[PDB]
Scaffold this active site. Structure first.
Site, PDB file in Angstrom:
ATOM      1  N   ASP A  70       0.943  -1.202   0.129  1.00  0.00           N
ATOM      2  CA  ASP A  70      -0.064   0.109   0.162  1.00  0.00           C
ATOM      3  C   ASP A  70       0.693   1.635   0.047  1.00  0.00           C
ATOM      4  OD1 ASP A  70       0.590  -0.163   2.884  1.00  0.00           O
ATOM      5  OD2 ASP A  70      -0.824   0.138   2.946  1.00  0.00           O
ATOM      6  N   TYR A  72       2.546   5.024   0.621  1.00  0.00           N
ATOM      7  CA  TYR A  72       3.425   5.281   1.601  1.00  0.00           C
ATOM      8  C   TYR A  72       2.963   6.086   2.513  1.00  0.00           C
ATOM      9  CZ  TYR A  72       8.236   5.381  -0.138  1.00  0.00           C
ATOM     10  OH  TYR A  72       9.342   4.481  -0.613  1.00  0.00           O
ATOM     11  N   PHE A  83       6.600   2.774  -3.901  1.00  0.00           N
ATOM     12  CA  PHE A  83       7.557   2.970  -4.030  1.00  0.00           C
ATOM     13  C   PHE A  83       8.890   4.582  -4.188  1.00  0.00           C
ATOM     14  CE2 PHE A  83       7.211  -1.546  -3.610  1.00  0.00           C
ATOM     15  CZ  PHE A  83       7.178  -2.087  -2.391  1.00  0.00           C
ATOM     16  N   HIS A 193       8.342  -8.046   1.645  1.00  0.00           N
ATOM     17  CA  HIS A 193       8.827  -7.329   1.864  1.00  0.00           C
ATOM     18  C   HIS A 193       9.924  -6.083   1.845  1.00  0.00           C
ATOM     19  CE1 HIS A 193       7.430  -2.846   2.231  1.00  0.00           C
ATOM     20  NE2 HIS A 193       6.720  -3.008   1.079  1.00  0.00           N
TER      21      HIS A 193
HETATM   22  O1  LIG Z   1       4.177  -1.473   0.340  1.00  0.00           O
HETATM   23  C1  LIG Z   1       4.856   0.204  -0.019  1.00  0.00           C
HETATM   24  N1  LIG Z   1       5.598   0.804   0.957  1.00  0.00           N
HETATM   25  C2  LIG Z   1       5.921   1.565   0.643  1.00  0.00           C
HETATM   26  C3  LIG Z   1       5.500   2.111  -0.051  1.00  0.00           C
HETATM   27  F1  LIG Z   1       5.904   3.155  -0.917  1.00  0.00           F
HETATM   28  C4  LIG Z   1       4.459   1.565  -1.578  1.00  0.00           C
HETATM   29  O2  LIG Z   1       3.780   2.390  -2.432  1.00  0.00           O
HETATM   30  N2  LIG Z   1       4.560   0.424  -1.193  1.00  0.00           N
END
Ligand SMILES: O=c1[nH]cc(F)c(=O)[nH]1
Ligand SMILES: [Cl-]
Length: 229
Positions: A70, A72, A83, A193
């Protein structure tokens, strides 16, 4: 602009609009969900106009899929590409610093100048999350609220194309897309992750970038140029 008010043909790239037709009503429902959050006094990230940004790069050009959990949770970070952060953001979020450490270890490139991943998106990497919004400061707060059907549909559609696909699935929620990648034109890389909470369980050392390119070449596709400036 608004996913409650305007159709996929306006909100996303043409190939994506067709790919997402099974979830057209569901996307409008997500717009209604976000409206109700604001009415209730809760906020969401990223900005509404960025929620579907990953689907503004051409569907037909995707060669690699990266999926996280999901967006940030800190206001000013999420931009609708998983990310990624705006080129003026510093310090980098911890998950991104971890990604870039693995990038340098795997590929041998210097650390990137900034956290803007738009070059990847412009080169055929889809930067998706399993869930496309979050309430500020509350990771996973929008889990189970209806985005999963949307991102499921996106992966199924990509997998159905007459084209090779490499998926990089980072974390548990991303890994729920693995069943949809069963067909022989698709191959998935799965790891923990990159967040500090899980990166030391197998994200570091995973070499996803070079592995994705070996997989693309092995399917007759061009590798990704992962090099960031
Ligand atoms: O899993 C995630 N962590 C952090 C993030 F920014 C993102 O887009 N996805
Ligand atoms: Cl809030």
């Amino acid at each position: 602009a608004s996913m409650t008010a305007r159709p996929l043909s306006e909100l996303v790239e043409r190939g994506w609009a067709a790919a997402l037709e099974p979830v057209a009503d569901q996307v409008a429902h997500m717009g209604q969900f976000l409206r109700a959050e604001i009415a209730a006094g809760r906020r969401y990230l990223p900005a509404g106009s960025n929620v579907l940004r990953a689907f503004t790069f051409p569907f037909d050009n995707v060669r690699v899929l990266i999926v996280g959990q999901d967006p940030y949770p800190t206001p000013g970070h999420a931009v609708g590409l998983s990310f990624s952060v705006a080129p003026d953001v510093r310090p980098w979020p911890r998950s991104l610093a971890n990604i870039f450490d693995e990038y340098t270890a795997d590929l041998g490139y210097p650390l990137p100048s900034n956290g803007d991943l738009t070059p990847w998106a412009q080169r055929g990497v889809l930067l998706l999350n399993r869930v496309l919004t979050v309430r500020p400061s509350n990771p996973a707060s929008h889990r189970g609220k209806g985005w999963e059907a949307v991102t499921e549909c996106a992966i199924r559609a990509l997998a159905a194309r007459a084209a090779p696909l490499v998926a990089i699935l980072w974390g548990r929620d991303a890994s729920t897309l693995k069943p949809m990648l069963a067909a022989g034109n698709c191959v998935a890389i799965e790891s923990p992750h990159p967040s500090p909470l899980s990166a030391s369980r197998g994200f570091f050392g995973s070499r996803p970038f070079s592995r994705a390119n070996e997989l693309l070449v092995g399917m007759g596709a061009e590798p990704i140029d992962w090099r960031l400036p």
